[PDB]
Amino acid sequence: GKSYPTVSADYQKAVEKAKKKLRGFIAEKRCAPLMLRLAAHSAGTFDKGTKTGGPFGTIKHPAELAHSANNGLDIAVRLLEPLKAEFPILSYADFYQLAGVVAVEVTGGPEVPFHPGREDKPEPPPEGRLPDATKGSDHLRDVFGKAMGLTDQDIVALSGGHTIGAAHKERSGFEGPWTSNPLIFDNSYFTELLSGEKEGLLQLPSDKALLSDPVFRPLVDKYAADEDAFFADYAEAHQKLSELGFAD
Ligand code: HEM
Numbered sequence: 629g630k631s632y633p634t635v636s637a638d639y640q641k642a643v644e645k646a647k648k649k650l651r652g653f654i655a656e657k658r659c660a661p662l663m664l665r666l667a668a669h670s671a672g673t674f675d676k677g678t679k680t681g682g683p684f685g686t687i688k689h690p691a692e693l694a695h696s697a698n699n700g701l702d703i704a705v706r707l708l709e710p711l712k713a714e715f716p717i718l719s720y721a722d723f724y725q726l727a728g729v730v731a732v733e734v735t736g737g738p739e740v741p742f743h744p745g746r747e748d749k750p751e752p753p754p755e756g757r758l759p760d761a762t763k764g765s766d767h768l769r770d771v772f773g774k775a776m777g778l779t780d781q782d783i784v785a786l787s788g789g790h791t792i793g794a795a796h797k798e799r800s801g802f803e804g805p806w807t808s809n810p811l812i813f814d815n816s817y818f819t820e821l822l823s824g825e826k827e828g829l830l831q832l833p834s835d836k837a838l839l840s841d842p843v844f845r846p847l848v849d850k851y852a853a854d855e856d857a858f859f860a861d862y863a864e865a866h867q868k869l870s871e872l873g874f875a876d
């Protein structure tokens with residue numbers, strides 16, 4: 629239901645060049661997971677009823693970074709500032725979604741379609757809209773479904789974003805990678821979810837909720853069995869997420 633806005637040729641040129649520089653920067657710095665977190669976690673403040681929040685660069689604001697659920701994201705914002713300064717024409721909104729798209733690509737993930745044109749919004753959304761790692765399927769549906777307007781399929785596919793990276797005890801309080809290959813985007817997050825708790829690896833209560841739900845569970849099984857089907861559903865979900873409140 630998207631109608632993407634027109635941007636100038638010079639805008640499109642900056643996106644292409646930013647995309648390449650982001651690949652190099654993110655690969656070298658080994659920060660694909662934190663970048664994916666910044667893009668996705670920050671898009672997830674969207675509330676469809678009121679058309680507030682969402683992927684509009686408000687996460688740059690010290691006020692939104694201060695939200696306890698955003699512990700560590702100030703690192704991400706700080707890391708990107710010098711590169712962003714090379715592309716003054718790009719909104720921060722687009723730049724952070726581009727960094728998320730690139731984070732998935734450089735780690736071996738699918739090519740998520742990207743459309744420019746998000747505008748930087750003045751006011752952060754209220755604290756507390758983010759998914760709670762201690763809660764379950766009802767909470768996931770409240771947040772991704774009722775607020776964001778995403779599907780049950782989207783929920784499971786997006787949870788697979790945890791196939792890269794780790795929790796940190798000084799950030800959320802949780803600790804460790806979800807997989808044995810935390811810089812590799814693949815279906816191992818679902819493989820690990822099915823095989824039970826392996827020593828050294830993390831499952832959040834939000835991750836575990838996927839196994840006990842009658843709708844979520846077939847999706848976990850499908851993705852564990854079929855990485856291509858994961859990659860397809862994932863690219864679809866991530867595009868939608870990055871586009872919440874944008875072009876409709
Ligand atoms: C489903 C609801 C979600 C919950 C409850 C959740 C919760 C969390 C928590 C608690 C952390 C750890 C923060 C830390 O201690 O460093 C984390 C990290 C992460 N999240 Fe999520 N998240 C969710 C959705 C998503 C989505 C939709 C994506 C992107 C598709 C995503 C991508 C990531 C990545 C890549 C990391 C690792 C960051 C790093 O390595 O520093 N998450 N998540």
Ligand code: NA
Nearest residue numbers: 791807809812
């Ligand atoms: Na992995």
